Amino acid sequence: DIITRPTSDSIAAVANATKPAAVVSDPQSM
Amino acid sequence: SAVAQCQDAGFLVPRPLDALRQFDVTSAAAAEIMHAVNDAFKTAFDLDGALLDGLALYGDPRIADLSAAYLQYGGNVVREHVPPGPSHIHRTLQQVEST
Amino acid sequence: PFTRLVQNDVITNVLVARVDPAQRGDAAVDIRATHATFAAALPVDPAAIVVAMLCGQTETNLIPSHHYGKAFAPLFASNAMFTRNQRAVITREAFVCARSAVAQCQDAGFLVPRPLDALRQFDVTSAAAAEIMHAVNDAFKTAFDLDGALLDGLALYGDPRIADLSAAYLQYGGNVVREHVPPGPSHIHRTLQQVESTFMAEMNLFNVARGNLYLVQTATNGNWSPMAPVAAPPFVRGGPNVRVVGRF
Amino acid sequence: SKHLSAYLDSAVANGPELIVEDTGLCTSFMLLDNIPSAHLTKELIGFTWFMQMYQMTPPLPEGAVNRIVCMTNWASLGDEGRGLEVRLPPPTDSSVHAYKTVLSRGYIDNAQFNPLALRSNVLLMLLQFTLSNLKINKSSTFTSDVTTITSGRMIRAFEGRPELLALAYPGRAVLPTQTKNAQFLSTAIADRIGRLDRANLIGGEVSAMVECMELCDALTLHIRETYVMLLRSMHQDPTQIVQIVNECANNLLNSTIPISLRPTILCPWFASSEDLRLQQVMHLVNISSNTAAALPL
Amino acid sequence: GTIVPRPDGLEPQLIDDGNVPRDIAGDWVYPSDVLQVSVAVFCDYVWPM
Amino acid sequence: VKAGRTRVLVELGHYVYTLHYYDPQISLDEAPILEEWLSKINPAGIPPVPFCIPIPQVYPCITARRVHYAFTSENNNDSLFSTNAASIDTAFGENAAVSPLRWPGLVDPNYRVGTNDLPNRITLYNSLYRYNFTYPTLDGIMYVRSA
Amino acid sequence: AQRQFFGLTYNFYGQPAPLFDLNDLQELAGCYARPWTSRFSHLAISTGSLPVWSARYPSVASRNIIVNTLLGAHLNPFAGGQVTSHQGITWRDPVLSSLAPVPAIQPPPVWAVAENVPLDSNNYPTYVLNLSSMWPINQDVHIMTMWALSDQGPIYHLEVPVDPMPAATTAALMAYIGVPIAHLAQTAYRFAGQLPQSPDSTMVSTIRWLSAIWFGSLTGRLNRSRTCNGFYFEFAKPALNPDQAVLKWNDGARAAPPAAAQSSYMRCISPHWQHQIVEVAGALMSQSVTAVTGLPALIDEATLPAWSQGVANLTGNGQGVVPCLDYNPVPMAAARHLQWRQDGLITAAQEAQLNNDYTAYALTIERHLTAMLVANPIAAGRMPIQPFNAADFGQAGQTAAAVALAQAMFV
């Protein structure tokens, strides 16, 4: 199999802390 | 070579992949690179025991050229460099990157 | 000092003062009338002393340096001596701040900056000072987690407004020493001054305002900002036809 | 026996609590949403926008009216506090209890304040403010962000307190739809964030000292920097320490010290003679001055 | 990737890199970064156009 | 005073204030609040000064003409941070935006590290140091044994 | 110990009276506290943490300057052998423990104002008789003198012996590695300040070396490439705030001792020092050594203000005279950067950039100070900042000689 390893927790914490929603429901969307 | 090619100010190596985007690696980032290369080699050659771990676990992985020295009380410094001999895998690897 | 057979140099009293005698009218008074004196004595039996003098003996071939080397070994193994140093520092800071606090509530005192002097402070009785000093003392005790008696005893005479430390001893020949014990340069005291200076500008952040208050009927229909008036205040004091109510 | 035992053993602890460390944010003022913004769903749609619908915590309050209020250690992650705090409520409330330290207890009503004793109470409250802020700005692990909004610098990841991370760096905001907050944040300089410099003494070790920029008010910063300055003032090199100990033993028991790098030690164990004299006099004043007091001594 | 809604029936606008709102219609160049951080809006105001 | 025939200046150097926001779309009279405030003044002390401020609105609204009495003599409005922060713009009410002066180290192009205006103004975004002191015990300093 | 000192009071820049108001005294030496070791009580690690940018005392050096002026009005006993009063304030006791308003019954004589007053310890016998407690006066008087003797930056002394460092100093320094300069300066001031010490003490030699190392690194001669017994100082990036330095120890090549013992006096020739913490700390730290050991030799009068010409026990022009050098930080920085490139620590492109950054930084300091002076004209009766002229920022001074000295000092 191909090799992977988890990143350090601190890296993951920052990355997960910034993930805006891709699709947001608003009434004015053309 | 791998670490040097990810920090765009590091030890001098041919850089065929500089066209690719990459944030400059800090000390912590390079450690992950060092680990992966270490693991890949130990897997490929089926090696037990430490092979390269100290470079990743302690100190800065951004190495340039290893050296050891001792200090005499008279202020004299005796330093012994250990530049590696001619590698073979490195050559073909650089070729693979280029193509 | 150990005096020996010198009649004029016999020390009669060792004394300490909790209060500066300069504040009250005691500049040129007998030292005994201004400082509290110690009193203690231990009655020793001559017979025991004589026996000890004449019945002293030691080991045959004692080496004092070696013996004391073993004896004193366990006594210097810990930070015991350093805790008192730390307590002394905290005591210094607490004392200075307490003096600074009390002085700023009086009209004047031990010459100290008074950035907050614009505020009102009517009661200046010693009772207020005692309450303030206790508040400061308790605050320090809480902050640095102390348990013993800190800064206490100063209020023994019940008037911290003139609290000051000094010591002296009196000789039969009428000679006096009268050493002073002023505090050293603290750190917290300076910061507190800086804080008060800052507060006098940013007081609005503490729900505290400044200036007078007006009361005028106004039937506005648009924007209305009482905290930031745009027009000049009407009928400032001393203006035309403005009256000041009587004091009753 | 109590006095004798006390006077004979000095290893009774009871030392002042000097070392207190903070890993949170060196600030004492909290931005506060006082009046919430209304939610519109029938008319006036689109006039307001919440970061909630984007699953994001806004770096700034977003109420109709926002206030700055004093709240000590409101972001103090880490060690336990000094034990005394100052917490003003928003100006829509009384906030009078913070000014009844003295001359108020049996005198004024619960819902008043003493206008004739204002100066003293204000001073004491500021004193409490000062004491509560006496901490050490401890470092914490830094890291780079592999996200798109990176600035090339490493930042201080508040693991376990993500809301702190959102608050600490307003520059890392994600801005849709140009609100009044956005009109301000959009002017933020890119790289004014995170670690600026460090003292890296030992390979692979934690940096002894680091300099960074983040959310931090000046006043608290000034206080804490003075506090460490005080601590440095009561510290001496090991050579001094061993010499002092040797002298105390009349040059008996002459010990010494190893010679190697000691990167970041700190031994606040000393003072000046004046402080010693002051404490000595103060201690005498505390005790009674009769023969029954000196006897245990 | 901020957009600027406007009242009174004016159709919305987009922030030019010179910090000046511009009309959506026309031609545009998106660096990868701004797209990755503003996809939510792009999916609703640019992509339909 | 309520009849509009008198104007009063209450002199007091400093005090504690209290706010009470209200909707500018409905009728209001500030008299009851003030009368309540007067009903709690003793020789011993006084309650905090009250004030009434309309909530800023995001659209041009129709405001009911209402009566106010109290207002200050200076600009004691420093604690205000911003209004209608989550909105495109403040239409009717007072329009406070985030003042850059408190954030020089975040928006000022000419900001230099290590500067401030501490005695006069407080800046919320600055640069600071952090430490990693260790606290060795006495025996950790020296050879503790017999000498 | 050291049973004697000499001193000199400040100069009035044309004004008729010493320049400080009551508030300055009340704030900087009030509370009836001892003023004798307060110089670091209002300093910290960096300017950013200090209220030195506005209002009263709007400069790094401002407070210590006013202190020196304040002392000039009360050091009469070492000039005329008597305690006096000035504007109603005097010492509480013959020991000069602290200040207080004059008593109403038997006031001391009023001080007659004068400037640049020479001072002798011998004029006040009680000082020696109470040396054990009056020792702190020695340090501060020395500091005041070392500043009063010069316009622009204060004067301090440097020296390097022909011997290697003793082991004791080595161990001490190995515990001061990560410490910034400001903290180091405090300890030196604290050490010599509070109790008499003999010059043949470990700390004395220790601080002496620190001053040497600081200067050697300041000139750029001491770097990661070349170090004194493994030690050297590291300076912050000019791009952010170059006004910071920390100690470092490294496995780089060690510089050889000089062929003969080197020593000289130093000062900053440009007004930048007034708002630059590294200059203040370095001067105070160096001056602390001379305070405990006394002046090794008379200072050369050749390049000193008019009032400093031929001051007894302080300045001279004879054979037994040590020259004093001076420098401007901007040319010094260029020299330091050039040395780095020649050592190979940086490229030429970097060196050009560093010069631009540092010059830009220095310009801000000048712009701040010059604006601050007109805000506090000296005619107002108090001097928070020393006066200067616009051209003073452009003086190169003896900078070329200075780096030459370090060249000879660390071979």
Author numbering:
A (entry chain N): 77 to 106
B (entry chain F): 869 to 967
C (entry chain G): 770 to 1017
D (entry chain G): 176 to 472
E (entry chain F): 1018 to 1066
F (entry chain G): 1067 to 1213
G (entry chain n): 2 to 412
From the paper:
Within ICPs, several dsRNA segments interact with each TEC and these interactions stabilize segments, enabling improved visualization of their major and minor grooves as observed in other RNA viruses. Five major dsRNA segments are observed adjacent to each TEC and are labeled based on their positions relative to the TEC, with a 6th segment observed adjacent to the template entrance in polar vertices. VP3 dimers (containing conformers VP3A and VP3B) encircle each 5-fold vertex; with VP3A conformers seated around the 5-fold vertex center, creating pores adjacent to each transcriptional enzymatic complex’s (TEC’s) template exit channel for direct transcript capping and release via VP1 turret proteins (TPs). Absent conspicuous VP3 rearrangement, the internal volume of the ICP increased from 5.51 × 107 Å3 to 6.02 × 107 Å3, or about 9.3% relative to the grass carp reovirus (GCRV) virion and ISVP with which golden shiner reovirus (GSRV) shares 96%–100% a.a. sequence identity. By reducing the packaging density and thus viscosity of the genome, the enlarged ICP provides the rigid dsRNA segments greater freedom of movement and presumably reduces the energy required to initiate transcription. The VP2 RNA-dependent RNA polymerase (RdRp) is organized into the N-terminal domain (NTD), C-terminal bracelet (CTB), and RdRp core which is further differentiated into the thumb, fingers, and palm subdomains. Our RdRp structure reveals several local architectural changes within these RdRp channels when compared to the ISVP. Viewed down the template entry channel, a positively charged finger domain loop extends into the template entry channel in the ICP, widening to accommodate nucleic acids. From within the channel, the priming loop—thought to separate template and transcript strands—shifts away from the transcript exit channel and orients the catalytically important serine residues towards the would-be incoming template. This migration away from the CTB widens the mRNA exit channel, likely promoting exit through the adjacent I5 pores and turrets.
Here we used a sequential symmetry expansion and relaxation approach to resolve the first asymmetric reconstruction of the ARV ICP by cryoEM to 3.3 Å. Lacking the outer capsid proteins VP5 and VP7, the ARV ICP retains the icosahedral, T = 2*, inner capsid shell composed of 60 asymmetric dimers of the 1214-residue, wedge-shaped, VP3 capsid shell proteins (CSPs) and 120 symmetrically arranged copies of the clamp protein (VP6) which form the ICP frame and provide support, respectively. Situated beneath 11 of 12 I5 vertices in ARV are TECs, heterodimers of RdRp and NTPase. Atop each I5 vertex sits a pentameric turret, composed of five copies of VP1 TPs with their axial channels reaching the nascent mRNA translocating pores of the TEC.
